[PDB]
Amino acid sequence: IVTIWVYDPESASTEELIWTAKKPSLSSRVLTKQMNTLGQRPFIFTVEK
Amino acid sequence: LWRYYINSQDYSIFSTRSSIKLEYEGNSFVSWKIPESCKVENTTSPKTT
Amino acid sequence: TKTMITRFFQTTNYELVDNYYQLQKENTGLMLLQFRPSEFSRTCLTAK
Amino acid sequence: GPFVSKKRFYVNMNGFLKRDASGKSLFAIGYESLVLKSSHFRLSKSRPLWYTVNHAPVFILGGFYDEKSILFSDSNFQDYVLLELSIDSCWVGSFYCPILGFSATIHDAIATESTLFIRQNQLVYYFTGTYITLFDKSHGSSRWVRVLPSECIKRLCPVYASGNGSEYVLALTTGKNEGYIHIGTITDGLVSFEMVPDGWSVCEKLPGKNCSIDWATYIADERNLLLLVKIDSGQFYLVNFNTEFKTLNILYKIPEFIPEAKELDFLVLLDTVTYTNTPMTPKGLFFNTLNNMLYIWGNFILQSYNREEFIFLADFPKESTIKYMVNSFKGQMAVVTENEEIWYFLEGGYDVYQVVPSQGWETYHNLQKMQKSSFHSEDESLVSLFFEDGKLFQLVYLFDVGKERLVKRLLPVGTLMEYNLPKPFTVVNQGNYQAISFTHTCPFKEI
Amino acid sequence: YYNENLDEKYQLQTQPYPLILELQSINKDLGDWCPYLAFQHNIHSQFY
Amino acid sequence: HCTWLLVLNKFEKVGLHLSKDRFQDHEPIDTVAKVFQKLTDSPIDPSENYLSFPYYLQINFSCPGQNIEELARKGHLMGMKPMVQINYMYSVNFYRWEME
Amino acid sequence: FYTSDIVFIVEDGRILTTKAGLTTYSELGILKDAIFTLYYDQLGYIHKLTPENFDAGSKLLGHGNSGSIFGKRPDLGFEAILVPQYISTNEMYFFAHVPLTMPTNIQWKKRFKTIHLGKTIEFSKTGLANIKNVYMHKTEPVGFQTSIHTEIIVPFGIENSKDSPCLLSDLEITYSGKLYYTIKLLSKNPLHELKSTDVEKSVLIPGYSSFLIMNITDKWTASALATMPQAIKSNLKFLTGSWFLYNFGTAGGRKWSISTRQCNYWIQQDSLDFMSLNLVKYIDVGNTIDFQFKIIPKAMSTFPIPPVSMVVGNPGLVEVKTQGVFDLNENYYLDIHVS
Amino acid sequence: QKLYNMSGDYGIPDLFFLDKGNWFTITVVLLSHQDTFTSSDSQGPTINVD
Ligand SMILES: *[C@@H]1O[C@H](CO)[C@@H](O[C@@H]2O[C@H](CO)[C@@H](O[C@@H]3O[C@H](CO)[C@@H](O)[C@H](O)[C@@H]3O)[C@H](O)[C@H]2NC(C)=O)[C@H](O)[C@H]1NC(C)=O
Ligand SMILES: *[C@@H]1O[C@H](CO)[C@@H](O)[C@H](O)[C@H]1NC(C)=O
Numbered sequence A: 001i002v003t004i005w006v007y008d009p010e011s012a013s014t015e016e017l018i019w020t021a022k023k024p025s026l027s028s029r030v031l032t033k034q035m036n037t038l039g040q041r042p043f044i045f046t047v048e049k
Numbered sequence B: 001l002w003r004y005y006i007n008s009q010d011y012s013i014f015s016t017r018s019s020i021k022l023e024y025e026g027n028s029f030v031s032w033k034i035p036e037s038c039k040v041e042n043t044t045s046p047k048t049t
Numbered sequence C: 001t002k003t004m005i006t007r008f009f010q011t012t013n014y015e016l017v018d019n020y021y022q023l024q025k026e027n028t029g030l031m032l033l034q035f036r037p038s039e040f041s042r043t044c045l046t047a048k
Numbered sequence D: 001g002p003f004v005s006k007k008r009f010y011v012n013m014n015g016f017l018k019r020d021a022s023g024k025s026l027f028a029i030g031y032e033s034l035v036l037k038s039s040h041f042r043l044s045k046s047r048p049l050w051y052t053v054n055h056a057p058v059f060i061l062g063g064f065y066d067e068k069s070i071l072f073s074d075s076n077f078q079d080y081v082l083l084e085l086s087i088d089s090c091w092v093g094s095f096y097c098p099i100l101g102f103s104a105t106i107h108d109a110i111a112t113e114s115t116l117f118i119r120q121n122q123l124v125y126y127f128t129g130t131y132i133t134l135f136d137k138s139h140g141s142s143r144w145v146r147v148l149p150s151e152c153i154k155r156l157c158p159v160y161a162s163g164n165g166s167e168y169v170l171a172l173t174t175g176k177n178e179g180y181i182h183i184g185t186i187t188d189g190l191v192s193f194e195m196v197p198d199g200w201s202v203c204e205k206l207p208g209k210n211c212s213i214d215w216a217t218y219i220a221d222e223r224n225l226l227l228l229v230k231i232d233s234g235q236f237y238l239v240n241f242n243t244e245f246k247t248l249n250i251l252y253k254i255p256e257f258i259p260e261a262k263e264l265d266f267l268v269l270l271d272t273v274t275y276t277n278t279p280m281t282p283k284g285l286f287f288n289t290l291n292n293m294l295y296i297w298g299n300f301i302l303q304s305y306n307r308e309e310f311i312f313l314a315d316f317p318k319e320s321t322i323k324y325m326v327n328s329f330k331g332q333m334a335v336v337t338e339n340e341e342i343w344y345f346l347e348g349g350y351d352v353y354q355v356v357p358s359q360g361w362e363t364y365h366n367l368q369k370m371q372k373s374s375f376h377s378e379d380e381s382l383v384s385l386f387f388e389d390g391k392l393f394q395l396v397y398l399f400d401v402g403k404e405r406l407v408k409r410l411l412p413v414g415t416l417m418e419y420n421l422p423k424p425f426t427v428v429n430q431g432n433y434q435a436i437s438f439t440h441t442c443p444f445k446e447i
Numbered sequence E: 001y002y003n004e005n006l007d008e009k010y011q012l013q014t015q016p017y018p019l020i021l022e023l024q025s026i027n028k029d030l031g032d033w034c035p036y037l038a039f040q041h042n043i044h045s046q047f048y
Numbered sequence F: 001h002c003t004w005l006l007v008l009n010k011f012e013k014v015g016l017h018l019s020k021d022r023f024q025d026h027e028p029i030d031t032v033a034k035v036f037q038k039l040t041d042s043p044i045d046p047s048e049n050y051l052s053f054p055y056y057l058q059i060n061f062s063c064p065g066q067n068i069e070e071l072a073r074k075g076h077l078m079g080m081k082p083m084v085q086i087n088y089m090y091s092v093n094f095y096r097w098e099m100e
Numbered sequence G: 001f002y003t004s005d006i007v008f009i010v011e012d013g014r015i016l017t018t019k020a021g022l023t024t025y026s027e028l029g030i031l032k033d034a035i036f037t038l039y040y041d042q043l044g045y046i047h048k049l050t051p052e053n054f055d056a057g058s059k060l061l062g063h064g065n066s067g068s069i070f071g072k073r074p075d076l077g078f079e080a081i082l083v084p085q086y087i088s089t090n091e092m093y094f095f096a097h098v099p100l101t102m103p104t105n106i107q108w109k110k111r112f113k114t115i116h117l118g119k120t121i122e123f124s125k126t127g128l129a130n131i132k133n134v135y136m137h138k139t140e141p142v143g144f145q146t147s148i149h150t151e152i153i154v155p156f157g158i159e160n161s162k163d164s165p166c167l168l169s170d171l172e173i174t175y176s177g178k179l180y181y182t183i184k185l186l187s188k189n190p191l192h193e194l195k196s197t198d199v200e201k202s203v204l205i206p207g208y209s210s211f212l213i214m215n216i217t218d219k220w221t222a223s224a225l226a227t228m229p230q231a232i233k234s235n236l237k238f239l240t241g242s243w244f245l246y247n248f249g250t251a252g253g254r255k256w257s258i259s260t261r262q263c264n265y266w267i268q269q270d271s272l273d274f275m276s277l278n279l280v281k282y283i284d285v286g287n288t289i290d291f292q293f294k295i296i297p298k299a300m301s302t303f304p305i306p307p308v309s310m311v312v313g314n315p316g317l318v319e320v321k322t323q324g325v326f327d328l329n330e331n332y333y334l335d336i337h338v339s
Numbered sequence H: 001q002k003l004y005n006m007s008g009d010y011g012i013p014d015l016f017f018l019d020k021g022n023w024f025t026i027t028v029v030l031l032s033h034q035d036t037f038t039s040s041d042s043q044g045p046t047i048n049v050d
């Protein structure tokens, strides 16, 4: 089970940059729901198949 | 001996909205030398942005 | 601009032949291909 | 033959006319016994033009200096007329609401399809025209009918869209029923007003001792009602009221001071920002239901995609206050302040461009004045502006001697944006000489 | 970087290395360039 | 450059006046049957009934440097003819009329 | 009738040319002969006829050119001061300078006429533009009476720093007493100065009004006239590399010319029995005839306005129905049905 | 008469109508500038234009 959210490297927390975070920060959460309102959704595409 | 760091390991994000941390190690240090296009925070300190 | 299209195929017929399994074995196995430009140097970041 | 450019006219049905005993056409809403003077437009400021968007056949402009006259126009102000109204000018004011200075002017003229509303000195009148290709002959009105007789109305607000086959109008009151507003429904030539927030006033479910409503937009889709509420201290809240249900929820709390951004164009108003020292003054709001966009305007411009996160558009200066704004409902917006300076917003970006005080307008004005045009004079006063099929028109008054007249005139924003001359350039070297080559700003050559 | 005599939390510290930018700085000092504008293909796999 | 001018005329004042008449009649009138009784060699059956709208649209064009009448004369003499496209907008009440 | 050319011979020997239907004209050349006449043959070539002289032309092409007999195409420009100004990135104003205190009867030598409409203006340094409008304004701007609105093709050459040394300085333009403009050089270096040869030159800054340096009152101060002086209302200050000099003056030799442009349209017709330039078609009763043309523009094209104006001689016997559409590459397709 | 198929006006329409799974497509042809793309854009199987 993978959990995906969007983040901006300039205004993200220090934990989101060393890949140790477990919950999105305030900026990442607000940016993620703003991108969701415009209609953005991620999907995972396998490469070999 | 000096170097520079950026906030993203990916270099497809690197553009004009990025910040570059310049770090100098050494006994003798006067200042930084940048073109007129770029600006540096606290241009007399060895660790700057 | 130069555009190349290449097709890989085999052209064998297995009807009315002797040693069908031996002929089948003789036309099987692995092979490796690579695509690259003619001349290239540094500053060229293309993964071949 | 010769080439004549394609033109669009509006031939709409006037329903406010009648015929006398001699068979001569007259107006039912007023007498045409006034002649246009130059003292009408010398000192007055511009005013918005309010109507239901694609359905109103008649345009009415109010807000003159001290007369109960209106500018009436069938079509789309290709021709107009100046009607002195037949309002009785009676007075019923008493201690039940505060007494203010009398003013014979007409305020907040709204022209919904088949019915037009006016306000004059805390009174609201409506007239319903007789249309035979719309409804019955008996629904039309014979004079101006006074609505809300027991209430003192402080403002009238429009609803541009329409839902469930009906039109809506809003009335914000003062003196009595401070937390309540009135929603008026027009169906088939019949108007009916309703006291929307029910028994309880909206000040009870909101901080502060008592509350005052400043502006309201009614979304007929979803039956929502967004409203600006000022409290006793002076903070502003944007709140929401549902009509199908009877609930109320706080939507946003407007900051007291504007945020700061030295070089940023857009700022997401998070909970960690830095404020300046100058105060904020929210004046109004606008909802677009095609794109679900919310705008709050005043000393600033706030833009919201959902109703949870807001964006400050920092290109608008903090010393200018937006008098009003118009929308083409196709992606363009015109903002008019109190210094009669006009700004342009496009929904595809985050920049607000000044157009009227600018270099492109100077070049265009000079080029029209040297082509011997008849719409441009050295002395002019903007009366109003509106949108028509994506073209921004402005009705203006030409003060020049011999041609003192009111004319509607295009404002081509693309030509002004192309004529804005200070642009980046380089001293290129060509033909063993030098030249001024302008750098390309667009990312693509053609589309 | 590895170094003992520390507080056990910084005995192994990782720092990135922007090799592409250093290479481009060297090339700006030198002046080499890529002979082709682009080379595209459609091999999206490795084992056909 | 040169621009169109459109005005509204009554049915009984087509050529007598070039001024503006206002849109006040909203019903079609029946002053056209006598003209259709005389079309004996045209495919006009007597069973079908005709009656006219009130009002005409009257069009000319004006272009600076010349007067309107000689411009219209030249446009007629060179083969020009105006083409008019009318679009109708539906009402708010979709419970009483259709959206077409 | 072939090539639809018209030639008028006017005393002093000038020759005016046009095509049928066109509303403009050009000047083919001059001819000082005593007695001569001009003759167009069937193929379109032009001959000059004199006793013992039947001349056909020095240079002969495949088609029927109308300027074969004349050697070099004349320059259509006059001797005056042209002060330019940008109005957009690709559009330009040129103002013609009529001097003050000079006679009224000889005014016409220093004005833009209607002949220049549809021509091109060329600079000897570099650059080329196409005239698209001629405006006359005798009163509102002072010192300038006519101007041309042109579109830039090749963006013109600016003045060097060796020939004019005032460029390496900071400028300051102030409003003078009556109507002039004092141009002061902030940098007081005696190397730069203002040379006496830098008179009748145009100083411009893209975004503001342009000035024509008319008088020199000091070693670092000039007096100049302003094109469209109604949009300053302040005091100006510039930097070293922000303002530029142009030499369109007649002093030392005039370096700008006006001449006709090359062909910019192609007419494609894929259908046979219509390739002739002269056609006669019969129609009986009821029967109709249709033809279709394609127009390919070699340069910038009129996007909203169709590039073909068509007239009918007698419309009272014929019925003409035309359709015309544009394209993406701006090709124009039209078809005509005639009954 | 009543027109069903005509060679009238072209270009984009203002307003669209949909009914239960019907769709539409548009094509945007872009003409780029002279030197918009350099050789640093060819990193893999396709040049990135974003
Ligand atoms: C071209 O069409 C326009 C309008 O479509 C015509 O202009 C109109 O001309 C009439 C003249 O019969 C003008 O009427 C005058 O009105 C005044 C005041 O109402 C009245 O006192 C006069 O006695 C006369 O009735 C009318 O104002 C004018 N309209 C406009 C907008 O200018 C024009 O005549 C047409 N041209 C030709 C050659 O027919
Ligand atoms: C009620 O609120 C208004 C502002 O909305 C304020 O002016 C007034 O003082 C308040 N009343 C009391 C009793 O505080």
Ligand SMILES: *[C@@H]1O[C@H](CO)[C@@H](O)[C@H](O)[C@H]1NC(C)=O
Pocket (backbone or CB within 6 Å): G215, G216, G217, G218
């Ligand atoms: C100004 O121009 C006039 C006219 O040519 C001339 O007589 C006068 O000497 C000039 N003065 C200066 C200071 O250049």
